[PDB]
Design a protein around this ligand. Structure first.
Ligand code: 1N1
Length: 263
């Protein structure tokens, strides 16, 4: 048996403002208050006006997939509204928005241990997804959300410079190509949201990677963290660490913080 999205009575939802817009539709912030339970802030996603039946189905599919996941580092689904129009997907509200934006607005503001904690959370969520045979395909800081307590959660259920060479060249997407992407996310985090490969063109990036180029340590990045990035970017996908190993390695760095001394 599979999980599913719970139906939420529309009277329990109060939409407060629009906080994002896309080609798919839009996202709002609001409040959810169910009888007997404390009010929580939520995010509310809707389809573009005039959506078709097919679009409505593909939409309620993002919800059914999300309903399968219950982990502290994966965005939490509250439920759906389907008995009323328009259709909506409701999740927890992540107060600090996307990780890329958040770090760029807070350049230099966190400690190494805080940053490593964020990476450990992302890794834990990815271990959970990969455990379940899911492949994200689009792992990047822009697709991670952050709450008030700095907890990072995987969201978003070809970006060339986040994508493993075998996924670009042979369309082979696996957890191991997600691990490559995770390495890029590590670099984004430790650089406070710099653009991977800077001004290099997509073509230049592809050629450089094939010739053995890998990104350098971000400014003031511990060597141990950069070495882990390099492990994630092994050419042969089978040579990359698994997500469980990544999390274990981060846990060991956090437990033995002197290991973060060398830069
Ligand atoms: C675009 C945006 N989202 C934020 N938080 C979100 N939490 C959950 C989100 C989400 O999309 N859920 C979701 C849904 C609903 C359906 C399917 C799949 C998913 Cl994953 S979006 C915060 C934010 N900020 C704006 C700027 N800042 C200043 C403050 O006023 C900080 C806050 N902006």
């Amino acid at each position: 048996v599979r999980e599913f999205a719970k139906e939420i009575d529309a009277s329990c939802i109060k939409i407060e403002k629009v906080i994002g817009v896309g080609e798919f539709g839009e996202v709002c912030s609001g409040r959810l208050k169910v009888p007997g339970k404390r009010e929580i802030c939520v995010a509310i996603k809707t389809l573009k006006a005039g959506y078709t039946d097919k679009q409505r189905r593909d939409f309620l599919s993002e919800a059914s997939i999300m309903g399968q996941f219950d982990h502290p580092n994966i965005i939490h689904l509250e439920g759906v509204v389907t008995k009323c129009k328009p259709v909506m997907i409701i999740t927890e509200y992540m107060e600090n928005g996307s990780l890329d934006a958040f770090l760029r607005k807070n350049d230099g503001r966190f400690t190494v241990i805080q940053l490593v904690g964020m990476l450990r959370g992302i890794g834990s969520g990815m271990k959970y997804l990969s455990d379940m045979s899911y492949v994200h395909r689009d792992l990047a800081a822009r697709n991670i959300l952050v709450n008030s307590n700095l907890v990072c959660k995987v969201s978003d259920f070809i970006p060339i410079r986040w994508t493993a060479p075998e996924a670009i060249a042979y369309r082979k997407f696996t957890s191991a190509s997600d691990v490559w992407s995770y390495g890029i996310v590590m670099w984004e985090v430790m650089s406070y949201g710099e653009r991977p490969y800077w001004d290099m063109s997509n073509q230049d990036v592809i050629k450089a990677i094939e010739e053995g180029y890998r990104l350098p340590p971000p400014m003031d990045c511990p060597i141990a963290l950069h070495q882990l990035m390099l492990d994630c970017w092994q050419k042969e996908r089978s040579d990359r660490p698994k997500f469980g190993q990544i999390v274990n390695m981060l846990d060991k760095l956090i437990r033995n913080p002197n290991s973060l001394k060398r830069t």
